[PDB]
Amino acid sequence: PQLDITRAISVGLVLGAFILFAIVGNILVILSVACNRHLRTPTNYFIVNLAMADLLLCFTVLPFSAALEVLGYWVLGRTFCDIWAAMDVLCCTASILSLCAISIDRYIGVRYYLQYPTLVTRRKAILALLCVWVLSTVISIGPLLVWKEPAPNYDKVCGVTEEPFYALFSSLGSFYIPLAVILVMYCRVYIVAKRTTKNLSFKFSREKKAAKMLGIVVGMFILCWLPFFIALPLGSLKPPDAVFKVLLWLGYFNSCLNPIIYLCAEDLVEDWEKARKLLEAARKGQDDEVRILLANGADVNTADETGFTPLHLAAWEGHLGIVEVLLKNGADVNANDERGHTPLHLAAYTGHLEIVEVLLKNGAGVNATDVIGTAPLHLAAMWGHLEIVEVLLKNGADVNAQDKFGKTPFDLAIDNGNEDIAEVLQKAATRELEVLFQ
Ligand SMILES: COc1cc2nc(N3CCN(C(=O)c4ccco4)[C@H]4CCCC[C@H]43)nc(N)c2cc1OC
């Protein structure tokens, strides 16, 4: 029994990973939509409800599961087992009925690319969410009233098992009937996305991108919960109590997968072909192509294998037109590569005054430092880009900024015999003494 020690850490790390994504991850998903007015979209309305269901499990289902394993058989069915039988179904029924609202929203979204925005608003989204909880409560808390008094002979309050009238009636209303709607709708979405993808406004690639991310979510839920919900009806015609325990735990694990799916899935950058196409267009300075590619569904914030985005390479290669349209198409102006360089670092290096001003105008980090601690002022001062050094200082660039090698933008100007820049950087440093000078 030497493995008993190693099993603790392995399970503990997996349970720690779960809690992290399931509680913190979901709260962060909720807060991102809650504190951004531009992110309050009907699709984002359903994922907040999906995160609320995962959160509601963690606080009202897992405590009962944790209390069982830790303390043992303090399993007082009359109350204890009735609450976290009821709460368990409620959360699961809420989750799958939310995925029904998603599966339908995504068919309305994919099929009707330019019609959807008007069709589905915040008002129509709240009603769909409202319905889910009204149904979910009836489906979950129904049986707890319908079957009021405990059975004679063979009661199983504190067991997943029961008679066929519950095993089928519950599993139908809580899984299979919802599953039918989902699979039928995401089967319909499946073929429309190919039919319009073969045939082919960016709207289709914004909503077929959305349909793909959420399709993974829908699949991972089905994959997680099918094993349990296969075994409840199938038992009536099998599994030990210890078998049911891991099948439920598998279902619970899904609560952490959603935040992970949103961090781990590339679908906006799913078109590896269309993604690397834009990265090249923006670098080569091909305004016609970049505009066309963006309009055809190309991700503005595509990450290179090194970490460079189209805005990086555009700022580097000195293509002002592409920098403007990228920003105009919602480009991360403070995008970082592996060493932390932003497009302003690159614009500063290659001496493009036009782009440095445009980046700053669009809210670029003037003092943004890379892993070495090198700021855009370090690079502009190093190569003799005096116009950029002045623009940078004007936007409040820090002259005292130091890299890992202890070198400051002034030092680099001196060490490259840049007399003009060194004077402007030395003057800039005595700014605090010009409180006395009016
Ligand atoms: C996700 O959907 C469902 C979840 C459900 N969860 C329970 N639980 C949760 C905890 N259980 C066990 O751990 C467990 C281990 C072995 C048998 O049960 C049992 C036993 C203790 C009391 C609550 C029970 N009971 C249901 N009847 C149930 C029904 C569901 O849909 C039809």
Author numbering: 38 to 237, 248, 284 to 319, 324 to 524
List sentences from the manuscript:
α-adrenergic receptors (αARs) are G protein-coupled receptors that regulate vital functions of the cardiovascular and nervous systems. Adrenergic receptors (ARs), or adrenoceptors, are aminergic G protein-coupled receptors (GPCRs) subdivided into nine distinct subtypes in humans,2—three α1ARs (α1A, α1B, α1D), three α2ARs (α2A, α2B, α2C), and three βARs (β1, β2, β3). Upon activation by the endogenous catecholamines epinephrine and norepinephrine, ARs mediate a large variety of physiological functions, many of which are of considerable clinical relevance. Here, we report the crystal structure of human α1BAR bound to the inverse agonist (+)-cyclazosin, enabled by the fusion to a DARPin crystallization chaperone.
The stabilizing mutations locked the receptor in a signaling-inactive state, as evidenced by the lack of agonist-induced Gq signaling compared to wild-type α1BAR. The result was an anisotropy-corrected dataset extending to 2.87 Å despite low completeness and poor data collection statistics in the highest resolution shell. Helix 8 has been replaced by the DARPin D12 fusion. ECL2 is tethered to the extracellular tip of TM3 through the conserved disulfide bridge between C19545.50 and C1183.25, forming a partial lid on the (+)-cyclazosin binding site. (+)-Cyclazosin adopts an inverted L-shaped binding mode in α1BARXTAL. The dimethoxyquinazoline moiety inserts deeply into the binding pocket, occupying the orthosteric binding site (OBS), i.e., the site that accommodates the endogenous agonists epinephrine and norepinephrine. The cis-decahydroquinoxaline moiety of (+)-cyclazosin, composed of a piperazine and a fused cyclohexane ring, is accommodated at the boundary between the OBS and a secondary binding pocket defined by TM3 and ECL2. Finally, the two distinct conformations adopted by the furan-2-yl-methanone moiety are accommodated in secondary binding pockets proximal to the extracellular surface. (+)-Cyclazosin can be thus considered a “bitopic” ligand that fills simultaneously both the OBS and secondary binding pockets. Our findings now reveal that residues A/L3.29 and L/Y6.55 are important determinants of selectivity between α1ARs and α2ARs.
